[PDB]
Amino acid sequence: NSRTVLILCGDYMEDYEVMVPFQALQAFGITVHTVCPGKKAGDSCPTAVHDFCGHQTYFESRGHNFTLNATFDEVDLSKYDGLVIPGGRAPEYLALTASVVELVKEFSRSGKPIASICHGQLILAAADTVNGRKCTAYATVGPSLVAAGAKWVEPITPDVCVVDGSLITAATYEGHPEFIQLFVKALGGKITGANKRILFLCGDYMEDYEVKVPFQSLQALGCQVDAVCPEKKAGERCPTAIHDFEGDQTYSEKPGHTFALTTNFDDLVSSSYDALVIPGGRAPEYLALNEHVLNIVKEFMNSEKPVASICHGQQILAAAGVLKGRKCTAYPAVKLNVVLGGGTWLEPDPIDRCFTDGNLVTGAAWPGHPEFVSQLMALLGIQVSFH
């Protein structure tokens, strides 16, 4: 509504760098279409998980499969307000697809906003639309951007972002917060009431998407967001799980990106936060056995403060006993816990639908992030206005 954005997808694009923008932009009220040359709506793109394990370069792994919702060569550029270019290993080959470069050129002339991250810039270079343009990218793309005539801004840190009129660029997904806020501002958006402090309850093997997307999305808004995990210091990292359906009766499990806690668990002053968020995956099942974690949940529910849990997150809510006489949804399987917890089941159909019950927001699976964050914003007083 009011704004429509087009994301340029491709095989092996960085998981994070495609889903975070796809869902955040939606949670803010922007329609988003995803396309990939030679593919139609409903088709799938494999994705890459780029991370660092102590080598001179990043290590790669397979992320979730990403389904396109729009068809390439059937898109009317005139009908889009902005364009986003994901990173990973897709730009490398997309940057050499005639129809892709023609598209980025055409859009580039309209003067409309273009947000490119990591290796995405390579496409910009091929289209030769960066001359004299200030900009940044993954350190490795610098030679190509300088040779393209760009005003290269070396990324001293993974988070640095750069703007030059309608050209927004980022080095890595660590800069998603600012990357996204700028593309929003660039779309004529205004964010209000975003001066909140949210606490995320994390743990080992939490769902990759279910942590990153909600987390960064809330950061792009401007909130101060912290994440903790029992027995871990503000530097520790948590391994994540990538849950996806690949044909069998239940989802499959694969290693995702490594997540970094921001605060120490022991030094946690719950009263200082305006909200609490619980990611799903396999972490909730063991976090729910933790006394300290439960008390934290109790405090937020007692204070009638906003609480947003997704997927298996509700397992911690049911164990806190805070679901009694409460309406909510969860991952289809954890309906067991909701009922046993004393809550009233809300059918999660479609799977992307989330529900609000007073101070309680719940989601079923990662496909519900748009409504998930959107409804947590409402309980927070955060709005995003355009036109």
H-helix or E-strand spanning residue 33: strand 31-35
Q: Interface with a copy of itself by CB under 8 A: which residues?
A: 10-12, 36-38, 45-46, 48, 55-57, 59-60, 62, 89-90, 92-93, 95-96, 122, 125-126, 139-140, 142-144, 147-148, 203-205, 229-231, 239, 241, 248-250, 252-253, 282-283, 285-286, 288-289, 315, 318-319, 332-333, 335-337, 340-341
Residue pair 115/82 in contact by the 8 Å Cβ criterion: yes
What one-letter code names the amino acid at 104?
V
Choice among 311, 328, 354, 369 that is catalytic: 311
Residue 275 CA to residue 375 CA, distance in Å, equals 12
Min dist CB 294 to a copy of itself, Å, is 10
Min dist CB 4 to a copy of itself, Å, is 25
Residue 351 CA to residue 30 CA, distance in Å, equals 20
Residue 220 CA to residue 262 CA, distance in Å, equals 16
Min dist CB 162 to a copy of itself, Å, is 18
Radius of gyration of the chain (CA): 20
Give Cβ neighbours of residue 262 (< 8 Å, ≥ 6 apart). Answer: 225, 226, 227, 228, 234
Min dist CB 32 to a copy of itself, Å, is 21
Residue 70 CA to residue 93 CA, distance in Å, equals 20
What number of other Cβ atoms are within 10 A of residue 376's Cβ? 26
Q: What are residue 309's DSSP bridge partners?
A: 278, 362
Choice among 118, 135, 238, 354 that is catalytic: 118
Tokens of 64: 């979730």
Residue 347 CA to residue 328 CA, distance in Å, equals 9
Looking at beta carbons only, is 76 or 246 nearer to a copy of itself?
Answer: 246
Looking at beta carbons only, is 190 or 292 nearer to a copy of itself?
Answer: 292
Residue pair 114/134 in contact by the 8 Å Cβ criterion: no
Choice among 119, 176, 243, 257 that is catalytic: 119
Looking at beta carbons only, is 29 or 46 nearer to a copy of itself?
Answer: 46
Looking at beta carbons only, is 96 or 156 nearer to a copy of itself?
Answer: 96
Tokens of 257: 């990106």
Looking at beta carbons only, is 24 or 242 nearer to a copy of itself?
Answer: 242
Choice among 312, 328, 354, 369 that is catalytic: 312
Min dist CB 96 to a copy of itself, Å, is 5
Looking at beta carbons only, is 127 or 194 nearer to a copy of itself?
Answer: 127
Min dist CB 93 to a copy of itself, Å, is 5
Cα angle value 190/386/8 (rounded, 5°): 100
Instruction: Assess whether 312 carries a catalytic annotation.
Output: yes
Instruction: Assess whether 119 carries a catalytic annotation.
Output: yes
CA distances from 322 to 134, 293, 363 (A): 51, 13, 16
Instruction: Just list the catalytic residues.
Output: 118-119, 311-312
